[PDB]
Amino acid sequence: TVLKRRKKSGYGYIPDIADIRDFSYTPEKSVIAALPPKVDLTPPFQVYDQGRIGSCTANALAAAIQFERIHDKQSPEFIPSRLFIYYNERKIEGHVNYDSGAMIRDGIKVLHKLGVCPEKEWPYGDTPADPRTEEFPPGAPASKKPSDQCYKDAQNYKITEYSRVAQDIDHLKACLAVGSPFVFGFSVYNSWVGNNSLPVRIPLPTKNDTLEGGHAVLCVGYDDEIRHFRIRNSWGNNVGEDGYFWMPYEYISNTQLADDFWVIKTVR
Ligand SMILES: O=c1ccn([C@@H]2O[C@H](COP(=O)(O)OP(=O)(O)O)[C@@H](O)[C@H]2O)c(=O)[nH]1
């Protein structure tokens, strides 16, 4: 029998260990009472492509940081270094020499305590783990320690706070309604990704489908007209609608399908 290695290339989310100290995102009751039918925060910067490594948490969080800098009127615009996030996440949990994936909460810890440098200073390279050893080969950009200069510059971009959003459709909508995207993790089934069919609308999984892996994305909107949330994926702009997809309300609100909804902020 060969046990199947759980796929990390293109994925990378590991469910968070719970911490009762986790801050709660508390939407204003006035906002919840008066949710609009449709929110579309899609930003102007195009999707990234995480390629063949398990960096989805860093891709989702890079985008939350890029998005917030726009809204906070911060300049210049840069793509945050995804490998800087991913390398430091694997100092906490996993290992920098393996494509282990990461918990969202640990990517958030990196942003809070270390920050993130611009991707130009620590550029992306998706050389994957060697399939025989399942270790990054020598020279793989993902296993390289960022330079001392990268760590110093990253300090200029720390977040100040982060909180969990309740897995409740009105709380997810209220978050987006006030103009805040959130990152979350979900299970991926062959009914969406099988044969790279990748429909724009993600089908609701059934017990006939197969679990393929754990993914994490930035959510940027919702539409009551079709009862889907809009997700920014990290698989390039030649899939979905320029890299974006629609996730059904019944998918995102299922505790057996999605979890680990987080908002980040940088205050002043
Ligand atoms: O904005 C924040 C700051 C901290 N925490 C929570 O508080 C815990 C400890 O965070 P802190 O930064 O105080 O920990 P330290 O690493 O400095 O001991 C974290 O694990 C989270 O549960 C949080 O949820 N949001």
Side-chain angles (χ1 to χ4, degrees):
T1 163
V2 1
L3 290 169
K4 237 212 85 83
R5 192 165 187 99
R6 189 173 291 112
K7 173 119 149 275
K8 297 275 170 179
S9 268
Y11 300 144
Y13 159 66
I14 300 169
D16 278 349
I17 180 176
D19 185 337
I20 60 175
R21 298 170 289 178
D22 285 352
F23 290 7
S24 299
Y25 177 87
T26 302
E28 276 305 322
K29 266 172 212 82
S30 53
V31 174
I32 288 161
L35 300 164
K38 172 184 186 81
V39 173
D40 184 11
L41 310 191
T42 300
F45 60 99
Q46 61 195 290
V47 298
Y48 322 126
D49 186 343
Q50 72 177 258
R52 297 172 286 167
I53 63 172
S55 63
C56 59
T57 66
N59 283 68
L61 285 169
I65 287 293
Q66 188 162 352
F67 182 102
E68 291 294 290
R69 281 179 78 257
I70 296 166
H71 200 34
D72 287 342
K73 306 170 195 180
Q74 305 287 308
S75 92
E77 174 156 24
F78 56 82
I79 289 170
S81 180
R82 286 167 295 155
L83 287 188
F84 182 88
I85 298 162
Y86 189 42
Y87 179 95
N88 290 296
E89 289 169 313
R90 285 180 292 137
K91 297 296 290 168
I92 298 166
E93 174 94 28
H95 191 103
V96 295
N97 287 342
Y98 299 92
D99 194 15
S100 61
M103 296 175 177
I104 299 170
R105 74 178 306 116
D106 287 342
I108 289 171
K109 198 91 179 170
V110 175
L111 296 173
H112 189 205
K113 302 296 181 181
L114 309 189
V116 51
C117 63
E119 190 156 85
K120 281 166 176 192
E121 191 172 8
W122 198 246
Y124 201 73
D126 82 324
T127 300
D130 179 74
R132 283 200 180 134
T133 66
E134 287 294 3
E135 192 172 342
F136 281 117
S143 64
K144 285 204 37 151
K145 180 180 181 160
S147 84
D148 279 358
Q149 197 47 49
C150 288
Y151 283 96
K152 187 154 157 298
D153 293 338
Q155 291 275 311
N156 290 328
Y157 306 110
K158 302 199 275 218
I159 68 171
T160 65
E161 171 200 343
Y162 53 104
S163 55
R164 290 191 181 262
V165 191
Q167 176 170 24
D168 169 304
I169 284 158
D170 286 347
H171 284 236
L172 307 177
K173 293 172 169 180
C175 189
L176 293 162
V178 305
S180 302
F182 57 85
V183 290
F184 72 102
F186 63 103
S187 292
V188 172
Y189 285 76
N190 72 311
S191 45
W192 182 34
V193 299
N195 307 319
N196 277 328
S197 45
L198 295 169
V200 177
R201 300 188 185 192
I202 303 177
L204 200 62
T206 67
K207 288 174 177 189
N208 306 304
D209 288 342
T210 162
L211 178 67
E212 303 298 320
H215 200 213
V217 295
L218 185 80
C219 180
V220 296
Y222 62 87
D223 195 340
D224 286 349
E225 183 65 47
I226 63 162
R227 296 174 49 80
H228 286 64
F229 285 83
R230 187 67 166 176
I231 59 166
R232 181 186 163 84
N233 208 344
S234 48
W235 294 345
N237 72 178
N238 301 133
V239 297
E241 290 173 342
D242 249 308
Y244 288 74
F245 295 85
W246 285 120
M247 179 173 280
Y249 285 9
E250 300 77 5
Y251 196 129
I252 206 168
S253 71
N254 190 334
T255 57
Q256 235 187 329
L257 289 173
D259 192 11
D260 300 322
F261 296 86
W262 285 104
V263 186
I264 64 162
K265 201 186 195 296
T266 307
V267 166
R268 280 48 183 260

